[model samples]
Target: RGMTLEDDLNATNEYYRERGIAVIHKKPTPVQFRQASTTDYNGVYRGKYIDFEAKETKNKTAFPLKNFHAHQIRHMEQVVAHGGICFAILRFSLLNETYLLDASHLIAWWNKQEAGGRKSIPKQEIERHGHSIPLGYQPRIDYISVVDNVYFTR
Candidate 1:
């Protein structure tokens, strides 16, 4: 499928902007530009800083950990450490499922590598730790709604 996670997020951000829900946009990586670096989307919501990475995989079994870089993990860690909201928007295209995996969970999994954990996160694990994002017609991927529940519900 040619449909990309970025394309979905871009449409969702546009929807949020048009309705004044939030001001979010994709940030371009400053390197060779193959994928997102620090964050894929950055914005402010309810006076809190929001940052997250968007990723997709066609694999049915698990999401490969190699898709994330050391610098990206570090960046997300800093974002969460400083009271900002950080997460990963993961899309499993083969299953047509999407999830909002928090930064803390991602960091924990990243640390698991040292302990000889699986190189990829199983889909079941992701479902257990992350929030599901419902697919929709207008925004396409309504991740901000999930974010609201995660960050603003408290």
Candidate 2:
């Protein structure tokens, strides 16, 4: 049950691609030059770049902020800065809940950590700040709908 959320998201992306509802995909883990070259998945969706990441946690209380790396944070920040829909799909195994937390909220807390502040984002905060993703059939975790409601149609 501690498996990373990326696996599920990869499966979901495959499902989405097969059905053609969207061409979105999870960006690959980046590697250094000496390290293997990893592909980043960025594509035009509804006339905008769909950039995202998936995070998993078994903690019943809160998601640790350290799960994100500095470079990845910067990359996602740039994606949003360029007017794209940048977000993260988080899964809480203990609660069996999935949520779509905006990059803005994560970045804010990430910066706070850099300033030698809190070590982890409290569960209460995530509950109050992020939006819960409803479970569905085709896309068990339909985050695009949340995005559509928050970004596209809004």
Candidate 3:
């Protein structure tokens, strides 16, 4: 099965809505520059705005920062600045693990790396700053559990 992280998320979003968890949708690609600056997904969960990007890679030691775009970073920054729940779903394929990393952590690395720093973030560092999103049969990625703990329960 030639599956993608994107496809899994599609199903996860469906389960979320059908099960009365949340209302989420993927941001379709836009042609116009003015309309294109946005993250991969956004929605309203538990009466709060949630937005995030999805990234899946096979790298075993580090997650490359190059996977993100300048516009997405700027967009995530705006979301967080406005008090929206923003983050990235980082999938380490080789490890068969997924993580929910806050937008602030991503922006911190993006800022330093975009200037003159490391090109990728160490896996250990990611573990320290992010929360694991266990795979599930119903929701697929089940990232909301991590979100619940980090944002709501915390």
Task: Compare the candidates by lDDT and give the number of the best one.
Answer: 3
Q: Which residue pairs clash in candidate 3? A: none
- Which candidate number has the best TM-score? 3
Candidate 2 lDDT, tens digit per residue, 6-29? 656666667778887678765545
For lDDT, candidate 1 versus 3, the one ahead is 3
Q: Please identify model 3 stretches exceeding 4 Å from their true place.
A: 32-35
The digit string of per-residue lDDT tens for model 3 on 34-151 reads 5467887999999899999999899998999989989999999999999999999988988888889999999999999978999998999899999988887888999988888889
Q: On residues 59-140, what C-alpha lDDT tens digit does candidate 1 reach at each position?
A: 9989988888888998999999999999999989888999999999988898897479988999998999999998988789
State each candidate's clash count: 0, 0, 0
What CA RMSD would you report for each candidate? 2.1, 3.0, 1.8
* lDDT-based ranking: 3, 1, 2
What lDDT would each prediction earn against the true structure? Answer: 0.87, 0.74, 0.90
User: CA lDDT of 38 in candidate 3?
Assistant: 81
Candidate with more favorable, higher lDDT: 2 or 3:
3
